[PDB]
């Protein structure tokens, strides 16, 4: 508390507060409709003056009166886009955006149109990207989801219903408040989905309370009815049964099916089964990669349209919009907030970013797609997702084990933490029976928890894939670079370099670079060019370097010539993008139409290159990939051959690389050529790769979904195979029980085509190349609570016998049996008729006695006459609820049954086409709103859909179009609407 | 509403003198340190704390140099600093001497 030590130094006091206020700077500090996006331009401003003056270039002021621009304004909804002109704008915010648009697009478009050196390929790719920008901007007009509705007052516009609209490719920060009428007239299906989304049958708060008492699951041999979608296949149905049986035992699992089998459809159908069948409709979270997330969104839109699936991406304000407009049914409360959504789709980045706002949610299910990202137990995603309070988890992946058993240990610890332990690593040098016993124990321990289906087990039309390992001899430059690096020779590695800045850290990386190409090193092309091309550097020698600097490039050139001779297309996969640059320049000076994909390419140009390569009229021959890019969603159906230039440490990356072209539905026999350098560092790379492949074939492949005696022999055989090295009509495009099939795709075929310096670029190639160089110089260049709750349902719907399931699951009834609620409704309806007739019998005899007394008093005047006038000018208790309307209960029951039978008899296909016919009701011209016979049919249609007395639901229903005709000093009101409903039903009946 | 030229600079002066974060990005400074180090010898590894200590040393040295430079510019009846102010500061400090 009090300080026990002080300072005897007599210093002055110092104010240490460094907090500053800028209130002395307000003299120069303080004392929403503008141009935001410009989309399209039109060559005619007002009218077509003529076709003259079509030559030359316009200036900036010339385009100010010649073009009209499509404008999306600030805080607008991409539907109020206006075709404006510079003189029609005046001076608003965002004029610099319009100037930049006009300058850049008009100047560059007329420059590429009017230039003489622009080819047809450039003009068609700029037209294609212009059309891509045009229909990408045109996609913003279509709504995608309606968030919330409000009643807002305009400038003397009384009250207007106003929807919160999300668009197709826009996010929740572009969600806008718009009129209900044009949204209904534009996309009424989303309006009907929104109207289903208020009074939905499935809520998180109505979920079951299964606490280790889940019901037994019977096997489903048919597709369930609540999964509408398309059609479910047999293997997907067995996966559904496996997931349901695993959840019935309270166990977590890994769906280890191969890519292309439709794992998304399987988990969407399992979520639908968990919501509809087992009534576990609480908050579920699905964590997916961002690139595949539209492929999950359309799957939820197609297969489970009745679900409240929401998307969680974007910046801070969009996630805030999702958080306080869509998470809770009651966002304005302060106590316990229950959830509104059913499924939350999100990514890893917003799990890490918003773990506080998402970890405090009692989730019922987690589904993590691409669980190999979760392969590390030390990563931040692992501790973020492992801290979640989720009862049941599921991991969806294609490769459960990639490097060793520690990764699979991390996955099974994330699934269920503690009954499964792995502490002993595997060693191929031991090969004892105890290791085989451990492997069989791991086989029998994770067998029901992993379901794996291969592409060779289902869809019996897939052509086989055979990969060939080719080993080539290094060049002299590669050999001397390998000798200089391995026996480090910094002075010799510098040599003729002026800078001489060589880094020999990561020795194995430099050895791999030397095994790939000497041109990866700095100042290395000059030494090859001066010693072989005689210093002239005139094109043809430089490419002559590019084939003979590396020992793999001669085999690659021979393979490209052989595949150009045939009708085949080739993908080239590399680990380094600088090698991709080397091959890109090799095909550039070579003159082959190539396309490329790496990490530097943005996703728009990636999609452009993928669609250009997959087009049926594609002139592209070779497509280059960096191996670890693009995700699992790259479609490369048109290609036939895959060449792995650099072997990955992880073989699952190479399997994904060869499965880029080996997808479901491939019409050609796919071969993979793996380019290997002899007696270099890539040999132990392939040794580690085949060790990991042997491990994956041991654990994962033998535990999918009299042979147990031969299992102890074939595990020993595969461990003897894994303990030995492999290093002790060649490029044919042809190929002519499963235990010896894995003994294939591992042999090494050597290649010793020693070709001299001058024997490449022959007289056919040299004549066309020298002519192009010569032509270039010429061209330069039931209690009481249930009784009152059922009484409110009688005034809304009517009879509770046929609507017992509707009121119970919507919260209008308590947690009780359906037969107990049905029996209480029938007893109250029967007792209402007897109590109504008891009071009406005594009232009839009262007026007879009062009329007799009035006749006696009439002769005295020629009092009792006032007694007869007062009498001339129905409540009961059923189950403790007093003053119940016994007369109105039977009248509303008969009126609702007559209205429901009349609508279904003649307007079963469409209830909005109901007409009153020749029946003319009383006029309602004294009301403040224009009420006609068309408005009377709209009110009666909403009574059979929303219920009687639901004035808020009738006014918010914009299908009838009576939102502005009802006020809730204005007429008609709530009391006037109730009287007109009873008078219309009594007149028709 | 446009601001007078000078009050924004005073706001940044009052803002950056309060906070103590590093005003130079980490990766360009690491690249600069490695480029400067690699001419003395090749194959140099760097601890993260070593580059951080070099960063705060550069921060303190350059902030003190701009204080001396601002004093030189104010002494020359100016509010704009110039390279002649910098070479005066370093000379009087003895760095150019």
UniProtKB/Swiss-Prot annotation, chain A:
Crosslink site(s) for Glycyl lysine isopeptide (Lys-Gly) (interchain with G-Cter in ubiquitin)? 900
- Source superkingdom: Eukaryota
E.C. numbers? 3.6.4.-
Q: Which reaction does it catalyse?
A: ATP + H2O = ADP + phosphate + H(+)
GO biological process annotations for this chain's record? Answer: chromatin remodeling; DNA double-strand break processing; double-strand break repair via homologous recombination; negative regulation of DNA-templated DNA replication; nucleosome organization; regulation of chromatin organization; regulation of transcription by RNA polymerase II; regulation of transcriptional start site selection at RNA polymerase II promoter
Q: What does this protein do?
A: ATP-dependent chromatin-remodeling factor which functions as substrate recognition component of the transcription regulatory histone acetylation (HAT) complexes SAGA and SLIK. It recognizes H3K4me. SAGA is involved in RNA polymerase II-dependent transcriptional regulation of approximately 10% of yeast genes. At the promoters, SAGA is required for recruitment of the basal transcription machinery.
Output this protein's name.
Chromo domain-containing protein 1
Give the organism, scientific name. Answer: Saccharomyces cerevisiae (strain ATCC 204508 / S288c)
- Organism placement in taxonomy: Eukaryota, Fungi, Dikarya, Ascomycota, Saccharomycotina
Q: Per UniProt, what is the name of the gene that codes for the protein in this document?
A: CHD1
Swiss-Prot record, chain B:
Q: Which UniProt keywords apply?
A: Acetylation, ADP-ribosylation, Chromosome, Citrullination, DNA-binding, Hydroxylation, Lipoprotein, Methylation, Nucleosome core, Nucleus, Palmitate, Phosphoprotein, Ubl conjugation
Query: Where, per the database record, does this protein carry Phosphothreonine?
Result: 42, 69
Positions bearing Phosphotyrosine: 3
Molecular-function annotations in GO:
DNA binding; protein heterodimerization activity; structural constituent of chromatin
Q: Which residues carry this modification: N6-glutaryllysine?
A: 18, 41, 77, 84
Q: Which residues carry this modification: N6-lactoyllysine?
A: 18, 41
Q: Tell me where in this chain the PTM N6,N6-dimethyllysine is found.
A: 41
Presence of keyword Lyase: no
| N6-acetyllysine: residues bearing it | 18, 41, 77, 84
Q: Which domain of life is it from?
A: Eukaryota
Which residues, renumbered to this chain, carry the PTM N6-methyllysine? Answer: 18, 26, 41, 84
UniProt subcellular location? Nucleus; Chromosome
Q: Phosphoserine-modified residues are where? A: 19, 48
Coiled coil spans: none
Covalent lipid sites (S-palmitoyl cysteine)? 72
Q: What is any one of the record's Gene Ontology cellular component terms?
A: nucleosome
Keyword check for Cell membrane, yes or no: no
Describe the processing and modification events after translation.
Answer: Acetylation is generally linked to gene activation. Acetylation at Lys-84 (H3K122ac) by EP300/p300 plays a central role in chromatin structure: localizes at the surface of the histone octamer and stimulates transcription, possibly by promoting nucleosome instability. H3R2me2a is present at the 3' of genes regardless of their transcription state and is enriched on inactive promoters, while it is absent on active promoters.
Q: What is its main location?
A: nucleus
**N6-succinyllysine-modified residues are where?**
18, 41, 84
Q: Which residues carry this modification: N6,N6,N6-trimethyllysine?
A: 18, 41
What family does this chain come from, according to its entry? Answer: Belongs to the histone H3 family.
Q: What does this protein do?
A: Core component of nucleosome. Nucleosomes wrap and compact DNA into chromatin, limiting DNA accessibility to the cellular machineries which require DNA as a template. Histones thereby play a central role in transcription regulation, DNA repair, DNA replication and chromosomal stability. DNA accessibility is regulated via a complex set of post-translational modifications of histones, also called histone code, and nucleosome remodeling.
Assembly with partners or alone: The nucleosome is a histone octamer containing two molecules each of H2A, H2B, H3 and H4 assembled in one H3-H4 heterotetramer and two H2A-H2B heterodimers. The octamer wraps approximately 147 bp of DNA.
Q: What is this protein called?
A: Histone H3.2
In terms of the parent sequence, the fragment covers 40 to 136 of 136
């Amino acid at each position: 508390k009090i300080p026990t030590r002080f300072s005897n130094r007599q210093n002055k006091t110092v104010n240490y507060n460094i907090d500053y206020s800028d209130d002395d700077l307000l003299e120069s500090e303080d004392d929403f409709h503008g141009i935001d996006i410009v989309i399209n331009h039109r060559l005619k401003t007002s009218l077509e003056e003529g076709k003259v003056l079509e030559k030359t270039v316009p200036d900036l002021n010339n385009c100010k009166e010649n073009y009209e621009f499509l404008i999306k304004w600030t805080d607008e909804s991409h539907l109020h886009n206006t075709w404006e002109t510079y003189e029609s704008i005046g001076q608003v915010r965002g004029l610099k955006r319009l100037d930049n648009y006009c300058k850049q697009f008009i100047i560059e478009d007329q420059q590429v149109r009017l230039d003489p050196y622009v080819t047809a390929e450039d003009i068609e790719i700029m037209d294609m990207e212009r059309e891509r920008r045009l229909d990408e901007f045109e996609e913003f007009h279509v709504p995608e989801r309606i968030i919330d509705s409000q009643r807002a007052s305009l400038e003397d516009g009384t009250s207007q219903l106003q929807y919160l609209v999300k668009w197709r490719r826009l996010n929740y920060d572009e969600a806008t408040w718009e009129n209900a009428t044009d949204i209904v007239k534009l996309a009424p299906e989303q309006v009907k989905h929104f109207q289903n989304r208020e009074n939905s049958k499935i809520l998180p708060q109505y979920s079951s309370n299964y606490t280790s008492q889940r019901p037994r699951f019977e096997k489903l041999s048919v597709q369930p009815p609540f999964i509408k979608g398309g059609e479910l296949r047999d293997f997907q149905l067995t996966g559904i049964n496996w997931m349901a049986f695993l959840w019935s035992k309270g166990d977590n699992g890994i769906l280890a099916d191969e890519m292309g089998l439709g794992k998304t459809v399987q988990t969407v159908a399992f979520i639908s089964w968990l919501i509809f069948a087992r009534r576990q409709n609480g908050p579920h979270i699905i964590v997916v990669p961002l690139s595949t997330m539209p492929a999950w969104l359309d799957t939820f839109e197609k297969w489970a349209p009745d679900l409240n699936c929401i998307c969680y991406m974007g910046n801070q304000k969009s996630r805030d919009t999702i958080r306080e407009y869509e998470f809770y049914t009651n966002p304005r409360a302060k106590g316990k907030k229950t959830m509104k959504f059913n499924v939350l789709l999100t990514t890893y980045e917003y799990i890490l970013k918003d773990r506080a706002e998402l970890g405090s949610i009692k989730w019922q299910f987690m589904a993590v797609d691409e669980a190999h990202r979760l392969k590390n137990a030390e990563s931040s995603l692992y501790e973020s997702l492992n801290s979640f309070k989720v009862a049941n988890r599921m991991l969806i992946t294609g490769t459960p084990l990639q490097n060793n058993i520690k990764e699979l240990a991390a996955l099974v610890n994330f699934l269920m933490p503690g009954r499964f332990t792995i502490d002993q690593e595997i060693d191929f040098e031991n090969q004892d029976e105890e290791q085989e016993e451990y492997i069989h124990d791991l086989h029998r321990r994770i067998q029901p928890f992993i379901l794996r289906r291969l592409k060779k087990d289902v869809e019996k039309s897939l052509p086989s894939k055979t990969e060939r390992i080719l080993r080539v001899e290094l060049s002299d430059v590669q050999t001397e670079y390998y000798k200089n690096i391995l026996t480090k020779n910094y002075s010799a590695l510098t040599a003729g370099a002026k800078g001489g800045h060589f880094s020999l850290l990561n020795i194995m990386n430099e050895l791999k670079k030397a095994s790939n190409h000497p041109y990866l090193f700095d100042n290395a092309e000059e030494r090859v060019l001066q010693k072989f091309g005689d210093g002239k550097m005139t094109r043809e020698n430089v490419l002559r370097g590019l084939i003979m600097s590396s020992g793999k490039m001669v085999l690659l050139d021979q393979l490209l010539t052989r595949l150009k001779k045939d009708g085949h297309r080739v993908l080239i996969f590399s680990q380094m993008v600088r090698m991709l640059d080397i091959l890109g320049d090799y095909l550039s000076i070579k003159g082959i139409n190539f396309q490329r994909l790496d990490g530097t390419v943005p996703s728009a140009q990636r999609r452009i290159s993928i669609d250009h390569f997959n087009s049926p009229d594609s002139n592209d021959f070779v497509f280059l990939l960096s191996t670890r890019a693009g995700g699992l969603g790259i479609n490369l159906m048109t290609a036939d051959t895959v060449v792995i230039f650099d072997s990955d440490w992880n073989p699952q990356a190479d399997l994904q690389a060869m499965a880029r072209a080996h997808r479901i539905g491939q019409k050609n026999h796919v071969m993979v050529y793996r380019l290997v350098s002899k007696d270099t560092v890539e040999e132990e790379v392939l040794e580690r790769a085949r060790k990991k492949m042997i491990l994956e074939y041991a654990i994962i492949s033998l535990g999918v979904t009299k042979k147990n005696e031969p299992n102890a022999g074939e595990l020993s055989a595969i461990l003897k195979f894994g303990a030995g090295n492999m290093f002790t009509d060649v490029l044919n495009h042809a190929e002519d029980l499963g235990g010896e099939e894995f003994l294939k795709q591992f042999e090494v075929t050597d290649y010793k085509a020693d070709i001299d310096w001058d024997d490449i670029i022959p007289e056919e190639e040299l004549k066309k190349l020298q002519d192009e160089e010569q032509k270039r110089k010429d061209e330069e260049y039931i209690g009481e609570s249930e009784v009152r709750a059922l009484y409110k349902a009688i005034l809304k719907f009517g009879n509770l016998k046929e609507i017992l399931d509707e009121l119970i699951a919507d919260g209008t009834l308590p947690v009780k049996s359906f037969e107990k609620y049905g029996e209480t409704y029938d007893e109250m309806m029967e007792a209402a008729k007897d109590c109504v007739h008891e009071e009406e019998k005594n009232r009839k005899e009262i007026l007879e006695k009062l009329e007799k007394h009035a006749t006696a008093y009439r002769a005295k005047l020629k009092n009792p006459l006032t007694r007869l006038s007062l009498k001339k000018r129905v409540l009961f208790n059923f189950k403790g609820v007093k003053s119940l309307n016994a007369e109105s209960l039977l009248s509303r029951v008969e009126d609702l049954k007559y209205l429901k039978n009349l609508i279904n008899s003649n307007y079963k296909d469409d209830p909005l086409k109901f007409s009153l016919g020749n029946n003319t009701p009383k006029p309602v011209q004294n009301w403040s709103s224009n009420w006609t016979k068309e408005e009377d049919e709209k009110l009666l249609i909403g009574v059979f859909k929303y219920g009687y007395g639901s004035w808020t639901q009738i006014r918010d229903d914009p299908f009838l179009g009576i939102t502005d005709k009802i006020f809730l000093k204005k007429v008609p009101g709530a009391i006037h609407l109730g009287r007109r409903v009873d008078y219309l039903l009594s007149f028709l009946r | 509403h446009r601001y007078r030229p000078g009050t924004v600079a005073l706001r940044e002066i009052r803002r950056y003198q309060k906070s103590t974060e590093l005003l130079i990005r980490k990766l360009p400074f690491q690249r600069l340190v490695r480029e400067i180090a690699q001419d003395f010898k090749t194959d140099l590894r760097f601890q993260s704390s070593a580059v951080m200590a070099l960063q705060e040393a550069s921060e303190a040295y350059l902030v003190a140099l701009f204080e001396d430079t601002n004093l030189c510019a104010i002494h020359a009846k100016r509010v704009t600093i110039m390279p002649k102010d910098i070479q005066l500061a370093r000379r009087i400090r003895g760095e150019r001497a």
